[PDB]
Amino acid sequence: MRECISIHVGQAGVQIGNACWELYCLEHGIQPDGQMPSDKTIGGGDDSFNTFFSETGAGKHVPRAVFVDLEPTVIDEVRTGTYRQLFHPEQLITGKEDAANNYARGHYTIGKEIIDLVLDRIRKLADQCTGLQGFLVFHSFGGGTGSGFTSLLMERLSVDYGKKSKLEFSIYPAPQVSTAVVEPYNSILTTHTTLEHSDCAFMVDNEAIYDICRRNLDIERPTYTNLNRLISQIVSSITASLRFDGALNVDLTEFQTNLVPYPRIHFPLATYAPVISAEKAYHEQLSVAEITNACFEPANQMVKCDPRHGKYMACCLLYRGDVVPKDVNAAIATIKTKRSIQFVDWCPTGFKVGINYQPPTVVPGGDLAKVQRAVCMLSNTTAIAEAWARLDHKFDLMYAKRAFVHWYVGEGMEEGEFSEAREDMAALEKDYEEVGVDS
Amino acid sequence: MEVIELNKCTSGQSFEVILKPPSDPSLEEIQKKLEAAEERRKYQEAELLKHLAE
Amino acid sequence: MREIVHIQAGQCGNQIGAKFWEVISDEHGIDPTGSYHGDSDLQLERINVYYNEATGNKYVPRAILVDLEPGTMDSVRSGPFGQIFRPDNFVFGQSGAGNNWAKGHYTEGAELVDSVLDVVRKESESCDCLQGFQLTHSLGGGTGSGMGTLLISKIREEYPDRIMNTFSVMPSPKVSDTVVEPYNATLSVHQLVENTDETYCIDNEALYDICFRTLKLTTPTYGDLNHLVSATMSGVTTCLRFPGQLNADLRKLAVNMVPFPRLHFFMPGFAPLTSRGSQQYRALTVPELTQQMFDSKNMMAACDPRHGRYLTVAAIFRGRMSMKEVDEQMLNVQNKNSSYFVEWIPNNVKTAVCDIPPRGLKMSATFIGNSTAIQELFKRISEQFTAMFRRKAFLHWYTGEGMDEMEFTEAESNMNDLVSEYQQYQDA
Amino acid sequence: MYTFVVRDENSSVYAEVSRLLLATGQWKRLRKDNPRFNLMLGERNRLPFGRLGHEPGLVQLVNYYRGADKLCRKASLVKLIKTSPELSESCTWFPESYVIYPTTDEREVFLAAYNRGNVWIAGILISSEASELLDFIDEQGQVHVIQKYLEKPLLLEPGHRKFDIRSWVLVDHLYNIYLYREGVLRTSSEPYNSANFQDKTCHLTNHCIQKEYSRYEEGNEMFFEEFNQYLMDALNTTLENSILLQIKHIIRSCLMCIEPAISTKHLHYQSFQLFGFDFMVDEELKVWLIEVNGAPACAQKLYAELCQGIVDVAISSVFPLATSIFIKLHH
Ligand SMILES: CC[C@]1(O)C[C@@H]2CN(CCc3c([nH]c4cc(Br)ccc34)[C@@](C(=O)OC)(c3cc4c(cc3OC)N(C)[C@H]3[C@@](O)(C(=O)OC)[C@H](OC(C)=O)[C@]5(CC)C=CCN6CC[C@]43[C@@H]65)C2)C1
Ligand SMILES: Nc1nc2c(ncn2[C@@H]2O[C@H](COP(=O)(O)OP(=O)(O)OP(=O)(O)O)[C@@H](O)[C@H]2O)c(=O)[nH]1
Ligand SMILES: Nc1nc2c(ncn2[C@@H]2O[C@H](COP(=O)(O)OP(=O)(O)O)[C@@H](O)[C@H]2O)c(=O)[nH]1
Ligand SMILES: [Ca+2]
Ligand SMILES: [Mg+2]
């Protein structure tokens, strides 16, 4: 057994992280106070779920989590909130004033000021691990902390743990909920600087989640709580394989091996189904065929984009609930003839499949209805580059006039770092194209 | 078409299915990075105070 | 606790300052004696941004009151909320400034400035996490204008890395008849361009137009004008005083509003417009809010927004209403008038909503635009300036205080540049 | 009101489409890089499809189907039919063809079917001896295709001259396949040349190269009421029974084949597109497909009507304002 440490950075990482541990706790049967009747290894154990929870002499199961926001307001809610007993104070790290939606201010100005302390509190968790494998890093692209500090933390982590793996859950900026016109700046900045230091990044476009909440949950104007419960669902699916018995995606290296043949093209598309409103007067349940097909519908992707126009390099099917392989393979047979699923030549057309019999856990009171089976697909398609083309266009429109740039320079960053980041993204867009040129 | 490496638990199963076969910066440079940036913002300010003292 | 130090200087600055306090003091449930008597923890949640915590559960405005003559401060001290202020925070001279910027900036004002500054320190000193400063003042007189911008220059020397914010009342010949006001305003704008982070251009020309044409007030008073100025000031600070996601401190507002350091002059706008005593009979619908707060009749700066382009825009809704509907209307606005929003700043309209409405109203909206159309204001003042300055008229009132023509030539130059900078970007 | 941007400043067809829209008083035209449009009349190449359908508040529609280049490139069209079971060797209406590369191609597989009377075709080159064809592609550096030249093509009279048939098809956002009732024959001005074929002009009906060597039709343009009348009096039949039936079938099969790759039924933006289908009619009144052009231009006589039909079928269907010219091909 090997542990994973989760690092939640910024408002979005912290609030998302909170929904994940809320969910995590339900699934493993841990109560708001760390106690877990299921565990008869009182004081410890090398069980699958211990990769995410260490165990306290008194019986407390404690997330291997570390939160960090360059200001106290949001994490203060975790200290005071409903799961206050779950975390030890040393892993809820707050500064005083925040990055002001300014990448430069979060990387350079206030980075330095808090980096060492974060690396310290982090090394405090590695020391408590028999066989640490790496980190799950949650953050927004668009805030100053989520973009700027995260790219700083990522570089210190590679220097201080070259052996270990680093996975990102990144939140991609959407006007419907963004709080800053400069998000495309911070997004390109942090992608360029984190790129070589991340092994697998799961990009969640707030826009995609927003419309799933309106269209399928009937939420008229989704808040961050709606948004975050769904993301915690999807995040749970991608991690289920590290907290439960299984033979698929059992440690972080496998995510890269199964999902990422090319290091830079390490951004796999996630697609989840079914999203059903719990307030919906009886729903006719969906089959393994129906949920699996729904996996190739753009309206269920965590990023709107058209995988028909692009190739595939890898595909993972992650089932939760009442599924057996005869139905999975039978479903793939059917859809395989209907949909446009071209892989790249240097890769075989195929699907790795994982089934957990326990159906998705619902957060009592949330918007999601319980369903007898569910599926998250993790496919690596060049079509996700679409997201980089939109974000790169917004950047080009602003930067060509140096709009707002003085805010970055004013913090010690040189204008040219802007151009070096955008050129990195230019090259990344070329990579995706090269691999996807076929049709 | 071909179902490979089936693996069964009491929690689920795992397997591959193929339909068709194929065909680091150091702590040093980082400190240079931050320190140099801080000295540019330290200078910019000093210029500001100098202009105000004028 | 992201504190803000408030400074009001001069007649205008002190009269709209006391009104701002009066209004947000009610909004937050603080009575004249300074004690909380409200029915919502929301009212107290961020009370630290404008009030200091005192013993007895008492809240004192973190406010400094400044003037070179003793009236005003007198009437302020005997105003409804007069007694809430810390009494050491009244700093005042005797001579006055005689509507002369040079007297405010250079002579009479230099005598009293240090003692103002000490109080600023004492307040700053106390601060957990200082956002910066907000200054109320007029640009047409001597004290607010000349000593107000002196004060700003000093404060920036001590707190070079805090935010400097001003509500600056612009002079208009429809409301006043002192011939040297264009001098005082041009000298002030020069300073404001250099040393503030955000300036709300509160234009007496627009306040007059609204009150006289729109509200059918045939004998407008400064009380009328200040009624519109205190609703605006409440509006544009909702996001700093209540819990919220958008523009919730001064730096974050500055990063969303200011794409180029010198173009930091905002046009506020408010709807519905009301006369003091208008006893409102129905609330506006969300679509009336939106049409109206972008209407030129609702701007507090006498500029035609259709004559320029919006660089950035914040929109603040107050009252109980539908987020879906607010969102639909804000999208409608931009998509039906999309040539008016520069395309090289994608998504430059940001929208916030506050459940708690202002006093009197069920529904309100507050508009903050960074339009290149603000160049109409500076052009108006520049043309008055030039008409006098090209014959060096009335200059002896300044050269006699020590100033040199050169200083005027430069102010004139910096403002004519400001206008050209606004025109360059409206042609992009 | 609705808005639209114009990003292919050369389209004849969409010139008349924006003029039509403006002149309705209900459609404003924006700065081409203003993203707050409903309609993008889009550029011809590297149209930025991934930017569409991410503007909340806006339904967005564009006048190309991403991926419809499969059908409209001479190299891809061939490979589309060969490798697509719906067409494949269900195919009786597309001449023999192979993709060829000036040195995954079929220059080897080609020689095989070659040796039989073989006349093939390729700035275009047709011959009858392989060497000079396979050597012509090896000339320039663009991917080329060699298809059987129709040695025995229906000739019009009075003139003994060849012709091709242009059909305009508009596919809207629901994937309705519409066929404009007015087609055109681009005739030849001089009589077809039996033995020997390299003169061109009389072998290439392609319009422009005919505006340069011509007598019988205004600009070598015969429309369908005349060509039907000739077919009656000359061949004792009709356009409908003899040509159009096969044409209608050929369009439906081609587009239905690629519908799963290009449909936008459940997509965050919607597409429509106007296609230009080019047919050969041969001695036996058998119809053959030649090229399909994704950016067709119209005939002068017909612009008014077609471009108004584009506006009414494919733009006002999605953006409703305040006896059809088209035949819907029913699948
Ligand atoms: C917000 C509060 C007040 O700020 C706003 C003002 C001025 N003030 C004092 C109040 C006052 C007024 N009038 C007075 C006459 C005298 Br003896 C003493 C006091 C006043 C005003 C009034 O009437 O209501 C109270 C009042 C005053 C003026 C006005 C409208 C108006 O009110 C509808 N014009 C727009 C101005 C005027 O120049 C013009 O048309 O061209 C621009 C006027 O010339 C003509 C031909 O009208 C006039 C009138 C004497 C001529 C001399 C100097 N000009 C300066 C103001 C202006 C005035 C209210 C501050
Ligand atoms: N889905 C989702 N996105 C969020 C949430 N919170 C913040 N975001 C995203 O983050 C962006 C704003 O920056 P944040 O991630 O909040 O940064 P922060 O944690 O507030 O720290 P700062 O950089 O100092 O602002 C917004 O545009 C959102 O898209 C959340 O709770 N859920
Ligand atoms: N809107 C508004 N403007 C005012 C008010 N009082 C004064 N002014 C403006 O301020 C200018 C005079 O400035 P003044 O107070 O003499 O400056 P000071 O002498 O330095 O304090 C005039 O042109 C008025 O237009 C007020 O209560 N409301
Ligand atoms: Ca255990
Ligand atoms: Mg934050």
Automatic annotation (TrEMBL), chain C:
Broad class of where this protein is predominantly found: cytoplasm
A cellular component term, taken from the record's GO annotations: microtubule
Entry-linked SUPFAM superfamilies: Tubulin C-terminal domain-like, Tubulin nucleotide-binding domain-like
Subcellular location: Cytoplasm, Cytoskeleton
List of residues binding GDP: Q11, C12, N99, S138, G141, G142, T143, G144, S176, E181, N204, Y222, N226
Residue ranges the record marks as coiled coil: none
Xref: InterPro entries: Beta-tubulin_BS (IPR013838), Beta_tubulin (IPR002453), Tub_FtsZ_C (IPR008280), Tubulin (IPR000217), Tubulin/FtsZ-like_C (IPR037103), Tubulin/FtsZ_2-layer-sand-dom (IPR018316), Tubulin/FtsZ_GTPase_sf (IPR036525), Tubulin_C (IPR023123)
Keywords, comma-separated and alphabetical: Cytoplasm, Cytoskeleton, GTP-binding, Isopeptide bond, Magnesium, Metal-binding, Methylation, Microtubule, Nucleotide-binding, Ubl conjugation
GO terms, molecular function: GTP binding; GTPase activity; metal ion binding; structural constituent of cytoskeleton
Domain Tubulin/FtsZ GTPase: 47-244
One of the protein's GO biological processes: microtubule-based process
Cofactor(s) in the UniProt record: Mg(2+)
Domain called Tubulin/FtsZ 2-layer sandwich: residue spans: 246-383
Family: Belongs to the tubulin family.
Task of the protein: Tubulin is the major constituent of microtubules, a cylinder consisting of laterally associated linear protofilaments composed of alpha- and beta-tubulin heterodimers. Microtubules grow by the addition of GTP-tubulin dimers to the microtubule end, where a stabilizing cap forms. Below the cap, tubulin dimers are in GDP-bound state, owing to GTPase activity of alpha-tubulin.
Subunit relationships: Dimer of alpha and beta chains. A typical microtubule is a hollow water-filled tube with an outer diameter of 25 nm and an inner diameter of 15 nM. Alpha-beta heterodimers associate head-to-tail to form protofilaments running lengthwise along the microtubule wall with the beta-tubulin subunit facing the microtubule plus end conferring a structural polarity. Microtubules usually have 13 protofilaments but different protofilament numbers can be found in some organisms and specialized cells.
Protein known as: Tubulin beta chain
Species assigned in the record: Sus scrofa (Pig)
Gene responsible for this protein: LOC100624785
Automatic annotation (TrEMBL), chain D:
Catalytic activity: C-terminal L-alpha-aminoacyl-L-glutamyl-L-glutamyl-[tubulin] + L-tyrosine + ATP = C-terminal L-alpha-aminoacyl-L-glutamyl-L-glutamyl-L-tyrosyl-[tubulin] + ADP + phosphate + H(+)
Enzyme Commission identifier(s): 6.3.2.25
Keywords: ATP-binding, Ligase, Magnesium, Metal-binding, Nucleotide-binding, Potassium
GO process annotations (BP): microtubule cytoskeleton organization; positive regulation of mitotic cell cycle; post-translational protein modification; regulation of metaphase plate congression
Superkingdom of this protein's organism: Eukaryota
Family annotation (Gene3D superfamilies): 3.40.50.11480, ATP-grasp fold, B domain
One GO location term (cellular component): spindle microtubule
Database matches in InterPro entries: TTL/TTLL_fam, Tubulin-tyrosine_ligase
Role of this protein: Catalyzes the post-translational addition of a tyrosine to the C-terminal end of detyrosinated alpha-tubulin.
Membership in a protein family: Belongs to the tubulin--tyrosine ligase family.
Quaternary assembly: Monomer.
This protein's name: Tubulin--tyrosine ligase
